[PDB]
Amino acid sequence: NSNKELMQRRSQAIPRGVGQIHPIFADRAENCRVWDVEGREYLDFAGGIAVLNTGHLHPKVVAAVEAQLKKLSHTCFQVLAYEPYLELCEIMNQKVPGDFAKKTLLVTTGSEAVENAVKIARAATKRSGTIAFSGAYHGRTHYTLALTGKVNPYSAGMGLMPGHVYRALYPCPLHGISEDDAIASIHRIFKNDAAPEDIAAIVIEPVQGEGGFYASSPAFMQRLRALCDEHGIMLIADEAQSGAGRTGTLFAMEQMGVAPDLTTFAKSIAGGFPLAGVTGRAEVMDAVAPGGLGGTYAGNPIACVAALEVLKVFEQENLLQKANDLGQKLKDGLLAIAEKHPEIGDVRGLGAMIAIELFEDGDHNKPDAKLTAEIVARARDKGLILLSCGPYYNVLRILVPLTIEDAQIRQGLEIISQCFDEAKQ
Amino acid sequence: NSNKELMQRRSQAIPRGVGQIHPIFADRAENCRVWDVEGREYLDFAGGIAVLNTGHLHPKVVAAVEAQLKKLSHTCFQVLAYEPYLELCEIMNQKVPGDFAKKTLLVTTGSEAVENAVKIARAATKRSGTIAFSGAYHGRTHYTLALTGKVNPYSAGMGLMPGHVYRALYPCPLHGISEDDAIASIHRIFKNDAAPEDIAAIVIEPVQGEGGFYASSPAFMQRLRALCDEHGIMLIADEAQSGAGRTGTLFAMEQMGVAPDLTTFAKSIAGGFPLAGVTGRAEVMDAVAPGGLGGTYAGNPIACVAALEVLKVFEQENLLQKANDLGQKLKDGLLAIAEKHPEIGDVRGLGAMIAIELFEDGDHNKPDAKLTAEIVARARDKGLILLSCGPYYNVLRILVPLTIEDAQIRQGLEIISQCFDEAKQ
Amino acid sequence: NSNKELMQRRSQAIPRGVGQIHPIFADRAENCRVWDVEGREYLDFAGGIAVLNTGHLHPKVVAAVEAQLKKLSHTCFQVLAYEPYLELCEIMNQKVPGDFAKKTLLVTTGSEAVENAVKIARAATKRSGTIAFSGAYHGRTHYTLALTGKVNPYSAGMGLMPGHVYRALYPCPLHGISEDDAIASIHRIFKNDAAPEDIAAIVIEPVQGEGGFYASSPAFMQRLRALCDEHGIMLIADEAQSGAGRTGTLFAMEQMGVAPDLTTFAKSIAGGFPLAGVTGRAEVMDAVAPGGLGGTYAGNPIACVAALEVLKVFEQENLLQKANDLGQKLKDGLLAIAEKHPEIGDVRGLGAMIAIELFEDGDHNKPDAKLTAEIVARARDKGLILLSCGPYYNVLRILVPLTIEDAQIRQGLEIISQCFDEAKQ
Amino acid sequence: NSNKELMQRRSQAIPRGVGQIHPIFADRAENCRVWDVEGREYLDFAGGIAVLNTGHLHPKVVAAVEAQLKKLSHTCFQVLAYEPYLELCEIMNQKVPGDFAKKTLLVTTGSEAVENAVKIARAATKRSGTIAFSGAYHGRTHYTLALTGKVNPYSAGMGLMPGHVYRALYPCPLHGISEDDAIASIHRIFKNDAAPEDIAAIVIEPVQGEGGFYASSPAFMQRLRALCDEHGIMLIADEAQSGAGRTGTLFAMEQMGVAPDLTTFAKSIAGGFPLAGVTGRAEVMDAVAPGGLGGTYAGNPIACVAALEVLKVFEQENLLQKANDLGQKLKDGLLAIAEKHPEIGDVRGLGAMIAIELFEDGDHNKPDAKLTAEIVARARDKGLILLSCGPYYNVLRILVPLTIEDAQIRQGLEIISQCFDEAKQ
Ligand SMILES: Cc1ncc(COP(=O)(O)O)c(CN)c1O
Ligand SMILES: Cc1ncc(COP(=O)(O)O)c(CN)c1O
Ligand SMILES: Cc1ncc(COP(=O)(O)O)c(CN)c1O
């Protein structure tokens, strides 16, 4: 019942392959607070990696889950259906952007969601290839590791992942890749490796998560939409991390001015319970033949009621607006800290999907991974849990529950400021 | 509040890709009883497809879940660890067959488990190919669909799944495939398509589930073990369906007289909550570098305490001995019915993983898919939930909770018996 | 000069990868005779591996070549056409089996022939997968090595060859593979790994060459044709080695009672000059868009007139009939030797595609690669060039020119006869 | 005996997939002269696509061919070796750039050469992936089509080519790709799709042929060599078209200041006879196990003595020097014509590997293909045979034999000048 003892036991029973960002064993939690086995208290700015937008154990969510535990926990929908699954699908068909008839499939993880969205796109187009972007992250199954634009550590040592996945450039002006280069990198694929007629879908994160919290602009997204229409390519928006309200709208695509053919959701959608899904143009969704979709746990009853309560909470507690206000308050505080620390070369984010990127002496081509990691460690020592991300591990992101208290906003910003001041000593 | 009303809403909100064995919407359940939204009661012989060996909402399991629901439901282990995960791993390391040290990785679904088992074998052997068997089922992600020995419906319209997966024959004398043919088929692969030094693993189900409840014999499994040993090939045992006590021992491999290098488990391990995992040789498990294993929901807290409680229940309530007793009563009962119906050409099963196979006029070359389907439908009319399986859809399997009461064992057999008699005239 | 001296320079300037069956350097050859640099004379029963059906430098062929040599040796057909290429295609379109219009593509090597045949079937059916047989040999390019049913040493050390090539069993009663087993193995692929809708072609050798001179039966070929017809799959007959008269008919398929959709030809077609090609159902051949088929040396001028002359020589000199006569004399001579050597467990062959298989003590389960190799080495010391084959290197094949005189036939057989007697002493 | 009639015959016997640049049937030729079946004469500025650097039927080469034709034309080296093959390998071990021991493999086509070079690199490094450049061209086999950086028409309609071939950007300032962009595009592959440890080789054309006659600079080639050295990746130089003295030196790599690990050669190596090969670092060439390399026609006797004679002709006639002077006279004349026609936006080339690129209104962003095509057709009408190329087909290239006469260089330039003036009237 000590963090160190538990870490020792871990090294004996669990593979080192499962990294451990923080050597801490959480015991209990509530909203933005977490207590370890030693009773220490921490402020959670990671949110279980964008999974806790309604916070740890939201009362409404927990009450719903407890009620469902009195009825049943599993039947396997495809064997014996149940209402929570159907209801969520109906609601997602409406909530997901796209002014047309849609259908929803529930699965269990973000990885499976992307897996099924691609299987569906292939069935609908009768094509086999897919295009993803540099720095993308879509999961850890063989195929999603291929879609993921990061070999190390996700696929390191395992040999080459499935082929017929082509790499396009994600637009990122901060690093010299115009939206023109991005659109041009897709045409390069068409001309050099896979003609449009062999590409079932173009998979993209409206805002890259693990990739650095880089957001696609509406104009770029609009150009991509047009490129897919022109070629009959399904546009797949992976919103496992950008969805569930993190950006100010339930789904980031709503702010792009265009609708994808398929959308995946997970993480925060159920506020702490295993659930994910795929919503898309009905005709596309129906392309797969009966019996070709499913999974044992898919749309687990408890997770479904949890998701339904999360949606009601976003409405009841005005969480979308709070995401926006929270984001502005965070960037303002971050911009202040930056006026005193050159290493911070960028402060960005839609809604509450906030991040800052660190460069050596503000040199926009000198990723400061060491400083980034130093801040994470300092924040832990001050009781703050943070996550870094980005292909160069020089991006600090904030994923604190949207239900955060005013005081905790000040507390996190303060601690962060202290970290940059104590590191510069 | 009407099964048919709900089915209608289902067809407008959910893709046809998701099949529906029984057009019934469950509302609540307890042990082996399920009640639909109309209040009609059914006896559950499908168990959410082998996920409810401890029955629906086993009270010990639910109380554990309730206690944990008071502490936390999610942190993402890689970010902040927690005891239920660590603790289940230790238990699994001890329980899965193998006299060597093992390490366990917790994920969320059976597909993920197979996916990770293979990634681990690839990293450990530094090889890329894998071998699976005919009629096998390992999941619905691109790669596991490739391992799965069945294209339709799981892959129709989609195109070809990931390559570098070679097919071997599962031993099945009942249908002409001898143990010698099985083994010969692996050497044929070594000789024709992929040398031993390019095969990371041979994935096999000790007892094929979707494949028809065909069990491997200890003798075959031993030849297979020796063959893997000789080539440094990892033997992966997929015990998602055969595991968690279904066959009379916690894992089917315990009755094979040999131990695999890796074992994947799921479904019944958590008795109704989303969880799966991989347990294998520690040094093999540790071949993946830190950061190469993970997943957002992996080893969800709630599901972890559920699995821990399930294992305690197997001990306290003697479920393994009950499995063996249940299987004998079922097989005795089914053999009785077979005396009056020649169509029943085989009654088989280890422990409680019981199945009967139907043939037109007892002709072992004429699988009766029509009769099989009819029995399933007649049973539903009598209040019994059944599932069929096998590549020819002529196998009826029984996956009723091991916690079933004696009277319910008779009720089910009697119903099954009436279904056959009534299928005659 | 010295054979050994040349072998030494060889080991210094050429990689060990290029094996050397006979450590002999040829200087001159004519018809069935070869003289090495040491002036020693050899009777050639290998024919450059089935490339010299009209013998070394057939005078008619040489005269045609010399005449063309005065005109031009290369222009690259795609840039400037030339009659020899056009004229050969026209003749092949009519002589290749198939009661329908055909078109012919000329390439340079048997490997390229197969490569293009598969590319054309893929473009015509719009499918990507192919099926090949156990023990098959189709070339040494990445893709043809995948089709080739033998990994060592062709693919050894290189890793896995291209995917989406599935393995069926070649019918071979001698070793336990019945025609039913072979056809069942194709359905197995359809059910387990690749649906018919995803298979562009089934590649087969009417008579396997490197595989062991195992011939397909008309009945089997007919079942395969019906199976292909039923699923829209192209039947590709690789006749690089069985073609050009070796079996008694210009192409082996003529003796099968059915026509393939595509046929690849090579080796003896040009009697000792670099040339290969693909003749097939015209609309299939035309499925590829202009600019899609090509190659620099494709249908080389000198090699085309040689091929046109080889065809005339076959008519004028009655070689098809002679192949049958030659084959009968060889099989009789070999069966007489077999009456004294039990190790000879089989004497088989269509036309002059003759082979004998050696077994230890005469046990079909004990391939005698050692005796086989001894016969080859002894025969060479006696002035007879032989080649072995088969997956277990226990097959002696006879590929001697069809233009051989009766005396060389008696002579070659005596030499072979003595080798067996001296090997037992 | 009419071009039109032969073309009509062609449409009925040969597939449309084989495009016909010029609808002319050549009857005979000599050095740089070609006569069609109608007796019309042409000045060949295409050389059978860089295959006739020593011109059509060079008398010395023809005499060597004739002498060998009296000895033998084929035995299949790996069966019965022969001196011509051994001697050419010895010479290429010296001639190919690289101050260190080398070994040589002889195959038959430029495609097989690239196929074997990769096979060799994979065995040497024990890795499966490869990297090629945009606009590259390496052959028409499945695998070389994957390496080739152009889908249509080379591999269009056929589906997706073999995976595990990744795309980098070829340096090309003219179109905005800096050397840094090229090098960085390689790092992008290492981070996003295939770690260095999985890349067996990087394949590059010192000067892209079909790609538009774009040459790599010494500086870039040096960075590419350092990058390879650091990761253990084999650098494969494909000199099928750039080699055989086209650039002023025998091989273009000689002018790069660095040596590749493997080099492929073909086309002009044998002045118009089928031959190709791979020369590389001995230890690397030897990585393949014995028997792993081969080919029926490989290093054909007649093509070998032709290649040997071609190398002698280069030394005797000083063709390397003439290449440089030819290139200069060509550039000067083209720069002249360029002054009156702004459409000619670039005049480039190493040695005699000369090309000009056309732009609509000199606007480098508007690749003028229609004008390029017009020039080719006008030139044909004026008796000059030309070829275009480049990803946008706006590149005119000159591959006229190096043995061309001074008076014909003027004649050729005059015809081109007239074409531009007239196309602009
Ligand atoms: C955009 C995105 N897509 C997919 C996934 C995979 O989801 P899971 O971990 O639930 O399998 C993640 C997880 N961080 C993600 O951020
Ligand atoms: C042997 C086996 N392996 C893997 C799976 C896949 O598990 P999941 O559906 O939880 O993804 C199943 C599911 N019926 C199975 O029976
Ligand atoms: C049936 C078959 N197919 C293809 C090939 C390959 O031909 P090549 O060596 O000319 O590339 C051979 C050569 N022995 C063959 O026998």
Ligand SMILES: Cc1ncc(COP(=O)(O)O)c(CN)c1O
């Ligand atoms: C650089 C290059 N590599 C490979 C090849 C393929 O050679 P082949 O046409 O002889 O098969 C070519 C032919 N245009 C080429 O230019």
